[PDB]
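Why predict the complex rather than its parts? Because the way molecules touch one another can change local conformation, and only a joint prediction can capture that. The input here totals 367 residues.
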Amino acid sequence: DGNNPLFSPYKMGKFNLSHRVVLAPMTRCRALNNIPQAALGEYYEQRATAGGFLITEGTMISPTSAGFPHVPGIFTKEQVREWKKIVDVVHAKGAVIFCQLWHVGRASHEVYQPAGAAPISSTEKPISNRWRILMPDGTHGIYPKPRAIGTYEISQVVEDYRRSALNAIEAGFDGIEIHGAHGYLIDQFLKDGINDRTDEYGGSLANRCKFITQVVQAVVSAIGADRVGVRVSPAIDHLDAMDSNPLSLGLAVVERLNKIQLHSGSKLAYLHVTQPRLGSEEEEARLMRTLRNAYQGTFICSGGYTRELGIEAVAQGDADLVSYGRLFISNPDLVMRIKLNAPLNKFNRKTFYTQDPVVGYTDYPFL
Ligand SMILES: Cc1cc2nc3c(=O)[nH]c(=O)nc-3n(C[C@H](O)[C@H](O)[C@H](O)COP(=O)(O)O)c2cc1C
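Output of the joint prediction:
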């Protein structure tokens, strides 16, 4: 229970992991002009451990997929070449690493789009004015009205995902994770609070799950199920990503994932789910455990976890792996700290998305 189950081995498909503390995917904006920089190598290397699993910050699948400044991409030859040197560094420490493929959909701005074109989405509805977009100059801005894409374009975006997954393997990544969370493109199709479509991609749960299903199937077909992770967050309302029945949505997605696994004859690397964060906590805990019990595979829980909460989830069978975000920003050796129950360093939100290669990036101290 407390003899630390976070340090009992785990087999995530073909990757034998030595412990269960996972580096959660986090955008840090140091990949200037969408090219992975040496700084990324330094950052990931510091956090890498023998038999530890790291998931990269969101990575672009096309010229139209970004919504933050200086986020890396993996759709060009130049980017793959640069990602490679970073993957080699991490592999030299004996870690397993997945690249997260991210498309922001409507959560963008003309400044992030080629020729200042409008961002794409399942809908023409813009994120509300209650949310603001971080701008290249550090200020914020307004999310514009997106362009609702048709089905032919939906299939092209799917191909963008498939080619990116192939580029990730080319770079040496052990696998990829599909970012189908936090109100981004995929969540814009999943969430009935956003998806107001009248075609075969909207309305019913089946139609709203069509886009994520086709995305996962394409990448599974291209690199193997065992090298694909899927991340979603039905109960997180970020960027107006709300649904009338969070749990029903979550279970419909798991159902499609179990079906993709059955038809392929292989299991996905995992299902990674982000929790919101008492009557509210218990409820979210019930939701998490139910999507876990429903998924025939490895489950990674994330969102507000501490050493204590991570230990508990694994001990109680609520998850097989626990991903850490913010605490991993400020504790390069978070795994070692959790192991020794050594004190943790605070993190500085101010430098989460700044562009300096070191300041608030790789200069947080080790124990
Ligand atoms: C600075 C920052 C950047 C993030 N970038 C991403 C991202 O690119 N993709 C994603 O799926 N989640 C992203 N997240 C959400 C985290 O992966 C994770 O779910 C969250 O940090 C978990 O809670 P914790 O911070 O208490 O560990 C980000 C979070 C932070 C704080």
